[PDB]
Amino acid sequence: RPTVTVFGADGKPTGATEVLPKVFSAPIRPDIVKHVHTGMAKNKRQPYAVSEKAGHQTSAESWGTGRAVARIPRVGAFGNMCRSGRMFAPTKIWRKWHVKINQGQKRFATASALAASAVAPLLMARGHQVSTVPEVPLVVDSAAVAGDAVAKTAAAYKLLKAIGAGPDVEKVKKSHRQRRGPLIVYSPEHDGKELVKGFRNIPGVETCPVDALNLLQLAPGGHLGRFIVWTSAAIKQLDAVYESK
Amino acid sequence: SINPKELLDRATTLLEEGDIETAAKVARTAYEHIGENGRHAGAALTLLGQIHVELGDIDAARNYYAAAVKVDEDGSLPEELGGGPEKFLWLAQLSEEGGHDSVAWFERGATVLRAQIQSLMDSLEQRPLSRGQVEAAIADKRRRLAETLCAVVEVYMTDLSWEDDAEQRCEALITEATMIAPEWPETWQTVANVRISQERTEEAREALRRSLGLWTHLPPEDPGVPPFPSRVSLVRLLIEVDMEEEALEVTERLIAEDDLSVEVWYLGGYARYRLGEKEREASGQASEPEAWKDTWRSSRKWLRQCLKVFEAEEYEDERLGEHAKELIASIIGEL
């Protein structure tokens, strides 16, 4: 039975421990998310569109490329508007008709991204600084965020330093759109909503409840390996929530 | 020995886990124990078709999907045995002639779908196991049909745009599609596509605003959110009819899902360039006369990043690559 240690606000192990949820065992496939969003595989010309077939006619200008073309000031002619009347000609969208497969792949991708989050080399490859993090997956005791513990911004920021998230939060401080920093995953039913009010103040860190986990946060830009801070309450439910959907 | 149907299920699970290589192996062995005369030949060939599509082997995919048709020419077999209408729709897109050949395949696919829809509805008034399940199944089927009609619309605005009854056929397709799936964003997206080419810009905007209102508020993984390639087409429509502000939001979400998408970096950069031109012309009447400069700065960042990913991926859209350069050089000259 693999288990993960839980840390207190002080930054040291509280002696307690949690069962490592099974989802972290899922096989890591680096380009699964990119695959879900791909048009035609290994197409380098127009991957999101079926190529235009001119037949015995002459191909329109805008065909075979993604670039906009010059256009005449706006206010039979229908076919002419299509070929040379538009900045962007109409295109045959590349449609992946086997929907259920694609849907299943999204589901697995979520598990695969969760697993990737608990692999230090993948996190560093995504540019997170995690050399100071004591353990992955990183689990904090929910007692440290039970209610108005980290409602204050000073208390939340102090918690991240002691847990080792400091260097990654400060990284962001150099030079909305903050998938670069750590993701705080919490259980709404037990941890509450107060902690969000404290973390929202901090730049870089992102907030999200366990039930509302998506690939945008777990795999920014379609790259697996998000730095995640779990609350003890969140870890326990985590295995049930993924199986629920 | 083992039942081949179990092998089909195994390969499907493997495919759904992104393990395409092993799926092809298991799907191959499966079909060998089924053959062309087998009960599950259609479903097996369909699966082998899906797999080779995901592999990027289009020519293998065409042969498998074609063989599936020869096993189930009218599509009357249950989806579980014969594969379903999917094989017709893929042959339409994979058609090397395109044009009339694609429409013919699409029509065959639409025919199968319409019959299945009608069958589910008869099964609805018949005492169902679950009314909710059937309505859901009907919805899914009507959406696939709507998307099929839209696919035909796009052939008539490209391959067969020289046809005299091109506009008439498109008008008939979008009326039926809005009838069967008025809640589906792609139908209204396609309505806008037609309108633009009809020089009906305001109605195009109206249609696009409607399609967006059906998904922009959804969570990013919800089945109601249109597929990536469909949202690329959307961005082109949005820049076309001067809704760059909306295009900016759509392009930012897309990059949050795949930041190795050359064409999306370009579209986002171009959308921001166009937006900057407008703000700049209105600069005299605007409150922030310098706002356009920041808008063009981000345009430059998107386009720089486009060329960067362009090189890294060894992209082959030369014309898009050269235009991105022109746009950057242009922004530079104007500071």
Q: What DSSP assignment string belongs to A225-238?
A: ---EEEEHHHHHHH
Tokens of B237: 């429509």
B88: number of CA atoms within 13 Å, CB side?
26
Nearest to B59 by CA among B97, B94, B27: B94
A154, burial (CB in 10 Å: exposed 0-12, middle 13-18, buried 19+): exposed
Helix (H) or strand (E) holding B47: helix B41-54
Using an 8 Å CB-CB cutoff, list chain A residues near B227.
37, 95-96, 102
At A4, phi and psi to the nearest 5? -115, 135
Domain limits for position A108? 1-245
Q: Report the distance separating Cα A142 and Cα A200, nearest Å.
A: 18
Q: How far is CA A203 from CA A46, A183, A218, B298, in A?
A: 38, 12, 18, 21
For residues A32 and B19, the answer to whether their CB atoms sit within 8 Å is: no
Gaps in chain A (C–N > 2.5 Å) come after which residues? 75, 175
Within 8 A by CB and 6+ apart from B2, the residues are none
Shortest CB distance from A82 goes to which of B98, B157, B319?
B157
For residues B147 and B178, the answer to whether their CB atoms sit within 8 Å is: no
B312, burial (CB in 10 Å: exposed 0-12, middle 13-18, buried 19+): exposed
Q: Chain B window 58-87: which residues touch A at a Cβ cutoff of 8 Å?
A: 58, 86
Tokens of B107: 């029509």
A78: number of CA atoms within 13 Å, CB side?
22
Q: Report the distance separating Cα A130 and Cα A198, nearest Å.
A: 22
Q: Report the distance separating Cα B83 and Cα B116, nearest Å.
A: 13
Tokens of A70: 């010059």
Within 8 A by CB and 6+ apart from B16, the residues are A101, A104, A105, A107, A108
For chain B, how big is the Rg over CA atoms in Å? Answer: 23
Q: Report the distance separating Cα B86 and Cα B75, nearest Å.
A: 10
For residues A29 and A113, the answer to whether their CB atoms sit within 8 Å is: no
Strand partners, A18: A4
For the sheet containing A206-209, what is the strand order?
A: A13-19, A3-7, A138-140, A228-231, A183-186, A206-209
For residues B156 and A109, the answer to whether their CB atoms sit within 8 Å is: no
Taking residue A245's Cβ as centre, other Cβ atoms within 10 Å add up to: 9
Using an 8 Å CB-CB cutoff, list chain B residues near A108.
16-18
Tokens of B277: 């031109």
Nearest to A89 by CA among B156, B305, B228: B156
Angle, CA of B70, B74 and B80, to the nearest 5°:
80
Strand partners, A208: A185
Give the chain A residue nearest B309 (alpha carbons).
Answer: A44
Q: Which of A23, A34, A53 to mutate to test the interface with B (most CBs of B within 10 A)?
A: A53
For residues B191 and B205, the answer to whether their CB atoms sit within 8 Å is: no
Q: Report the distance separating Cα A31 and Cα A25, nearest Å.
A: 18
Nearest to B14 by CA among B47, B56, B57: B47
The C-alpha of A18 sits at a distance from chain B's nearest C-alpha, in angstroms, of: 28
Q: Report the distance separating Cα A45 and Cα B168, nearest Å.
A: 31
Angle, CA of B45, B46 and B50, to the nearest 5°:
115
Shortest CB distance from A108 goes to which of B16, B198, B230?
B16
For residues A115 and A21, the answer to whether their CB atoms sit within 8 Å is: no
Q: What torsion, rounded to 10 degrees, do the Cα atoms B217, B223, B237, A177 define? A: 50
For residues A215 and B228, the answer to whether their CB atoms sit within 8 Å is: no
Taking residue A57's Cβ as centre, other Cβ atoms within 10 Å add up to: 13
Query: Is A63 within 8 Å of B220 when comparing Cβ atoms?
Result: no
Alpha-carbon dihedral sign for residues A7, A8, A9, A11: negative
**DSSP 8-state symbol, B104:** H
Q: Report the distance separating Cα A163 and Cα B232, nearest Å.
A: 41
Q: Report the distance separating Cα A81 and Cα A87, nearest Å.
A: 10
Q: Report the distance separating Cα B20 and Cα B15, nearest Å.
A: 5
For residues A12 and A164, the answer to whether their CB atoms sit within 8 Å is: no
Longest dimension (CA), chain A: 79
Taking residue B261's Cβ as centre, other Cβ atoms within 10 Å add up to: 27
**DSSP 8-state symbol, A117:** T
Write the single-letter amino acid at A139.
V
Resolution, given in Å to one decimal, reads: 2.4
Q: Report the distance separating Cα B200 and Cα A106, nearest Å.
A: 38
Do the bridges between strand A138-140 and strand A228-231 make them parallel or antiparallel, or are there none, so unpaired? parallel
Report the interhelical angle of B4-16 vs A99-116 (nearest 10°): 60
Q: Report the distance separating Cα A158 and Cα A58, nearest Å.
A: 67
Method: X-ray
Using an 8 Å CB-CB cutoff, list chain B residues near A220.
256, 259
**DSSP 8-state symbol, A221:** G
Gaps in chain B (C–N > 2.5 Å) come after which residues? none
Using H for helix, E for strand and C for coil, what is the string for chain A? CCEEEEECCCCCEEEEEEECCHHHHCCCCCCHHHHHCCCCCCCCCCCCEECCCCCCCCCCCCCCCCCCCCCCCCCCHHHHHHHHCCCCCCCEECCCCCHHHHHHHHHHHHHHHHHHCCCHHHHHHCCCCCCCCCCCCEEECHHHCCCCCCCCHHHHHHHHHHHCCHHHHHHHCCCCCCCCCCEEEECHHHHCCHHHHHHCCCCCCEEEEHHHCCHHHHCHHHCCCCCEEEEHHHHHHHHHHHHHC
Q: Report the distance separating Cα B262 and Cα B267, nearest Å.
A: 9
Q: Report the distance separating Cα A97 and Cα B83, nearest Å.
A: 12
For chain A, how big is the Rg over CA atoms in Å? Answer: 24
Query: Is A86 within 8 Å of B239 when comparing Cβ atoms?
Result: no
Strand partners, A231: A140
Looking at chain A, how many residues does it have?
Answer: 245
For residues B201 and B192, the answer to whether their CB atoms sit within 8 Å is: no
Q: How far is CA B298 from CA B254, B272, B323, B333, in A?
A: 16, 7, 17, 15
Q: Report the distance separating Cα A96 and Cα B324, nearest Å.
A: 29
At A109, phi and psi to the nearest 5? -55, -40
Looking at chain B, how many residues does it have?
Answer: 335
For residues A206 and A182, the answer to whether their CB atoms sit within 8 Å is: yes
A167, burial (CB in 10 Å: exposed 0-12, middle 13-18, buried 19+): middle
Q: Sort residue B242 into left (φ over 0), alpha (ψ -120 to 50) or beta.
A: left
Q: Report the distance separating Cα B166 and Cα B273, nearest Å.
A: 34
Within 8 A by CB and 6+ apart from A190, the residues are A142, A146, A233
Q: Report the distance separating Cα B231 and Cα B244, nearest Å.
A: 14
Structural domain count of chain A: 1
For residues A185 and B191, the answer to whether their CB atoms sit within 8 Å is: no
* CATH homologous superfamily, domain B4-335: Tetratricopeptide repeat domain (1.25.40.10)
Tokens of A199: 């973390």
Helix, strand, coil percentages (3-state) for chain B, rounded to 5, are: 75, 0, 25
